[PDB]
Amino acid sequence: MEVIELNKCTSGQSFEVILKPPSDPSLEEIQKKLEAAEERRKYQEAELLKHLAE
Amino acid sequence: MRECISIHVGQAGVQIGNACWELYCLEHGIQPDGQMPSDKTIGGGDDSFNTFFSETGAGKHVPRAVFVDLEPTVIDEVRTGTYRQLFHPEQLITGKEDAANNYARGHYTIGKEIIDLVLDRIRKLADQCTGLQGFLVFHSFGGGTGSGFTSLLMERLSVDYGKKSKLEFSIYPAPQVSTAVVEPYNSILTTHTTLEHSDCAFMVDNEAIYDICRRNLDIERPTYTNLNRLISQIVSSITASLRFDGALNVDLTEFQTNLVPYPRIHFPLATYAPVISAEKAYHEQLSVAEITNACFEPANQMVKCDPRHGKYMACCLLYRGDVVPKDVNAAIATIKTKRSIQFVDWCPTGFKVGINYQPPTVVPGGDLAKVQRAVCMLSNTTAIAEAWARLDHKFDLMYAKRAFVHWYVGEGMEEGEFSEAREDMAALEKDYEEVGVD
Amino acid sequence: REIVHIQAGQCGNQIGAKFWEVISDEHGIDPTGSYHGDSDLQLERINVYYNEATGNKYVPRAILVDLEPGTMDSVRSGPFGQIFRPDNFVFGQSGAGNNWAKGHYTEGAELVDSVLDVVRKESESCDCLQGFQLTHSLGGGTGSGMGTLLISKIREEYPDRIMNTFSVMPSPKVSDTVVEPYNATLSVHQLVENTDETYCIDNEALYDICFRTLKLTTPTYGDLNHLVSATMSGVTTCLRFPGQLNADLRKLAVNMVPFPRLHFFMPGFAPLTSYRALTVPELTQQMFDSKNMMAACDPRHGRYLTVAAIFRGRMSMKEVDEQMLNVQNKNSSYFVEWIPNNVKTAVCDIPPRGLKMSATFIGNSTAIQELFKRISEQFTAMFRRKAFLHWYTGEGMDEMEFTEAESNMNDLVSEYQQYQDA
Amino acid sequence: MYTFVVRDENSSVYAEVSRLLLATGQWKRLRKDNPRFNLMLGERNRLPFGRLGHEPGLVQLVNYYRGADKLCRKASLVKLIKTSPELSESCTWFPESYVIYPTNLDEREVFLAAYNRRREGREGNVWIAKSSAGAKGEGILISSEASELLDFIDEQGQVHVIQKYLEKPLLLEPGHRKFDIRSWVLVDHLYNIYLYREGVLRTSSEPYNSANFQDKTCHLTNHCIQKEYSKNYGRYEEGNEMFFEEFNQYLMDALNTTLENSILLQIKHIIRSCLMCIEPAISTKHLHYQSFQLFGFDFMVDEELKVWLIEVNGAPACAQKLYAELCQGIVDVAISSVFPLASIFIKLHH
């Protein structure tokens, strides 16, 4: 229907056709999530080695 | 001129990156050694193609890209391959052992050890930019690195580049070529954590690409190579406006304002036509009406779903080749009268249209025949939520039994992150149904 | 990304030597460690199992362990005997006398530190060690008792690496001693806690296959080990040759093991060997057939949690998916529905010796519980009367440790049964 | 070997298709949440169409058309007919209808407008208010005063339709009784439209009384309303069901015509018009899974032998003596057509 914003250049062109109208976490916090996971890994490994020591 | 940096994460991101930068060079007349005989400004310049390539004083055109994988074998092939001369060493980053298809291993255990390095290699390219607009991030949903490391990278990019757009090209998992039972886990985990950090993401379901290669290229058993060459055509069609003279979509920002009114609903459906076998000698060249009409065939979508049963929030048509605006408007007129194209009430029923006169380039010795004209449609339709519903169902099946969850918990992830991620997805499915269903 | 291989005791070393013979031949390595193959694929992932020495020699990353010299002189004299690193033969002189207590606590403890010394040496030259592969039997004393002692100590020193075993389970049909159920039960308990992946190689099954299918009236360990050789080659293909699926030990574990304790696999192979190549449909049908299973469990008695299939040879990549899909779509009852797409398929172009094509099956099936039930009944029949127990308490063990091993195995059985009704 | 799953245990039609499938020995039934199926006999509400056709190596088929609800809901059928150029507001075979929302939330004033011109022209101004929440015989009001209509709708929370009540229905004799015709139509995956040979008349066993719309038993022809409130259930015919052979004989004896000429041409025309209208929206021609669906069209006939469309049911049951034939037919042209093993339908061409 209505064609608008027609722009032409050597490379090509663009336009808009309307047919009808309508009706973050900080570095530090990321840092603590990474360390919280690391500590859970170390804790689980510490338990394993303790169990192996027994 | 405003630069874009491309980041390629994990096997899928890297190999797709390969196919794209191969294609970019072919389209811009850049040779494998990085020279570009048509670029009469030696050493620099702010042409449209410089948004993706920097220049050495020796007339070398170098991609604004970084490749990252947690294991070396895939990136080693870039380092040794045809376009080895293209990238410099600092652009290709590899670890020793991968994330083993485990989001938690990619994000927490191994991610913590390489993230600062990767951000530094990225800070380098950023420092070469007079006006960085942001990032294009390529990755799989299913891989441990693609899912887990990408989401950690995206969190940090928002910290270190708050004002910058980030766009994704994401490979949605398909059992026909997938390599891990837990990819639905990885998909939901990465989508949950990346959601607030991505401004716009183009999902490619390997299922759809696989079937387009079988059906239209007559390839009985498509390879990653077949898939990626096709994918790179869609990617090229989508980025072409950033690399060539034009008035749409001239920068990453415009991608969001043209396709994404609802911030969380930032996953536009890509549809591409025509896809023609190069082994097909006599080929009748499709018209503008025909290739436009093919944009409303699910068989041509990057994700199989039924747009008739959803609503549109936005639609962009990107034509390459022999196309004049008159024929496009005639084609859209006729299609409007046949197809089911319901827009949401608060959006205009309409199409933004871009035409680049240079027809698609095809990798010589490829599977795709050269055509006179092609189109890529980007439409933000609620129908794409079918992919979320599929994925969430698989997640629900395994998680109810806690199948495989100990692999993630063992990497230091808490179980609650599972159900949190799943809840975010349940909300996501809810947002789509609100917007698109009477 | 290297694998360190360990073989312990008579069974472990004899099947271990065969494995190295067979894959040396696949990678084109001769008995003197020199390469003479005509394919590039042979050398691409060669370092996973082989070290390089000057002269371009390839030396197996293999450690040979035993409490008596006997079997290892046989190896060193055997076909590829000269290919092993001389320092990697670690052996004592007393033997374990088919006694788990001797292997695990008395005779074995005396020899284990020197073994760990060679393991440490091999690991220290590894670019990025994946983990370990151990061949052994569970019915004897050294492989079983010292083998599981090794596993525990290796885990203590390399707690973040993958531990994989090929464990030969005892059968009264091919039995050396009446105390095999004791040794096996004590060992299963170790495996459950300390391995990530175990291929259950059942001597019961190997015998029945030789007798029933291959028509061998009087099966020998040589015949049994022929089947074990082929199975081991087939299930390590994805580690040894380039490919997408299960290409290292951790990714395999992530695909195959949904719950940590349930990591005991039923291997299967086709064609069962001892002029016409099988069709892809024949490979597929046979590899899922109970008579091709190496664990002597009826797969129709349980359900598959996960499955890995590996096809070797030049065949229709297309026809493989059709067959693999058809097997699942036509017996979908025997696959748990709460692990979607739980069957993964690999193809490798290099066939094994003397075959144009073959297929190797790896199932995590709840039917493996039959194997543990069988051992558990044999164990209990003797333990209830404390028969032969004094040979174990005489090495410092008390009955309680038997009781706990028995409870742990019965628990394992109830866990399989748990998921077979889900 | 073909596989299927059953997800609607309350369906008499597909429970029969299920046993027919098993009885061929070439079909196997699966646990309802097993995805490796060829055929989904789906649930009525929120059937998960988005999870269909993503199973590598399985041609998948479902017994429902996604989007057919547009046809099979009171309000949305009205909307579909008014807003589709193929049907049009000047559609001559659909009674004058209006979609009315209760005020606790529309087409109210549009309905009043037309109601005035009738009261103004002495014209018969009896309308029937109904909805989709109306289970069986409850939730229906037949008034000649519009006020009682809208006041009754506001006593309900869901959307309603008001529609011109046919004051001159064809009356069967003896009995002087209203009736409606049920037609069963099967649409296969190729979008062939198949009209089942046998229909049935849901008759009233009470004489039509155009002076008392309060007694809903000579006005409503529902089988539940007759089997309860009517004191003459099964008097003239068994279960208030007159089948086509009898009805046609009647039309010949009484009116000197045939069922085919007087009524069936119109019925086939209406069925084609409705289903061709929505075809672009629901066809699974180039879709990754396939659909078929059994519909139940209900018709009214007036004393001029004009056929009026009342509604379309998307999950119809069948008459008792017709279950075997129609179910065998469903297996035959809708299922086995897609999954070949080792006519009772009239095809409405287009």
Ligand SMILES: Nc1nc2c(ncn2[C@@H]2O[C@H](COP(=O)(O)OP(=O)(O)OP(=O)(O)O)[C@@H](O)[C@H]2O)c(=O)[nH]1
């Ligand atoms: N389209 C396409 N998909 C790929 C490609 N490579 C892998 N995939 C898909 O990506 C998923 C696997 O993720 P990968 O990218 O390979 O894994 P990764 O990012 O390297 O992570 P890890 O290996 O687990 O450390 C599966 O769904 C694959 O099918 C590719 O080259 N092209």
Ligand SMILES: Nc1ncnc2c1ncn2[C@@H]1O[C@H](COP(=O)(O)OP(=O)(O)CP(=O)(O)O)[C@@H](O)[C@H]1O
């Ligand atoms: N505009 C109208 N004029 C005359 N009679 C009408 C009418 N609308 C409905 N009826 C009568 O209303 C009754 C139909 O009810 P309705 O169409 O709502 O079906 P229903 O949903 O209650 C049960 P089913 O789905 O099996 O048809 C019939 O007996 C019919 O005679």
Ligand SMILES: Nc1nc2c(ncn2[C@@H]2O[C@H](COP(=O)(O)OP(=O)(O)O)[C@@H](O)[C@H]2O)c(=O)[nH]1
């Ligand atoms: N399949 C197979 N089984 C064996 C072999 N040698 C011994 N066995 C079995 O292993 C058990 C005996 O253990 P063995 O390894 O000989 O004792 P060890 O030297 O103390 O470890 C019994 O179950 C035997 O049946 C062999 O070469 N092949």
Ligand SMILES: [Ca+2]
């Ligand atoms: Ca320049």
Ligand SMILES: [Ca+2]
């Ligand atoms: Ca942001």
Ligand SMILES: [Ca+2]
């Ligand atoms: Ca001593």
Ligand SMILES: [Mg+2]
């Ligand atoms: Mg990887």
Ligand SMILES: [Mg+2]
């Ligand atoms: Mg022995």
